[PDB]
Amino acid sequence: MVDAFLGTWKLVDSKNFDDYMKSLGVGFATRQVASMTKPTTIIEKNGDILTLKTHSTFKNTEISFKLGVEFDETTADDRKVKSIVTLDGGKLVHLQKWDGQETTLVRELIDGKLILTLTHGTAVCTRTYEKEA
Ligand SMILES: CCCCCCCC/C=C\CCCCCCCCCCCC(=O)O
């Protein structure tokens, strides 16, 4: 079910990430660095447990979760959130909740590319990742 998402992925296109970060309250200097960073995202499975790594020089993250089971998460920008990841329409949907706010991180496969759509407030960011061999 999750298997076409698995592997190592490299950022190849980003649209509106500054808008998304600004909506989350990320400061200007951090948004500069982020705007020039191309993370590597690694998605692995071991039974029911998925592990999603995001690697870059200035910041790394890692989460492990079971689909459909809430987990605590501390995001790259240091929000402490309540998270759940599910499959919806073949898309891997990650919902984060904190302080009565929400943001969604939706991953969809289109023509072999992984499209990540990030929504917070009115801001909608689209980032495209391509699979490493
Ligand atoms: C873990 C790498 C995240 C992207 C590079 C961040 C470089 C600047 C370092 C710290 C600031 C964190 C900034 C924005 C974090 C917003 C929430 C996570 C966005 C994930 C985007 C992605 O996976 O492509």
**Sheet containing 113-120: which strands, arranged edge to edge?**
61-66, 49-55, 40-46, 7-15, 123-131, 113-120, 101-110, 91-98, 80-88, 71-74
* Nearest protein CA to atom 10 of ligand 1, as residue: 59
Backbone angles phi, psi at 23, to 5 degrees: -60, -35
40 annotated as belonging to a binding site for a ligand? no
Length of the chain: 133
In a domain, 29, yes or no: yes
* Number of structural domains the chain divides into: 1
Resolution (A): 0.8
In angstroms, how far is CA 67 from the centroid of its own chain? 15
- Return the CATH number at 120: 2.40.128.20
Does the beta carbon of 120 sit less than 6 angstroms from any atom of ligand 1? no
Distance CA 94, CA 83 (A): 7
Q: For residue 81, what are the CA distances in angstroms to 20, 70, 73, 116?
A: 17, 10, 5, 19
Torsion sign over Cα 38, 95, 66, 99: positive
Residue 14, number of CB atoms within 10 A of its CB: 20
Q: Is residue 2 part of a domain?
A: no
The alpha carbon of 132 and the centre of ligand 1 are apart by a number of angstroms equal to 20
Q: How many whole angstroms separate alpha carbon 48 and alpha carbon 22?
A: 34
Could you tell me if residue 1 is inside a domain? no
Burial class of residue 17 (count of CB atoms within 10 Å of its CB; 0-12, 13-18, 19+): buried
Rounded to the nearest whole angstrom, what is the distance from the C-alpha of residue 77 to the centroid of ligand 1? 7
Range of the domain at 28: 7-129
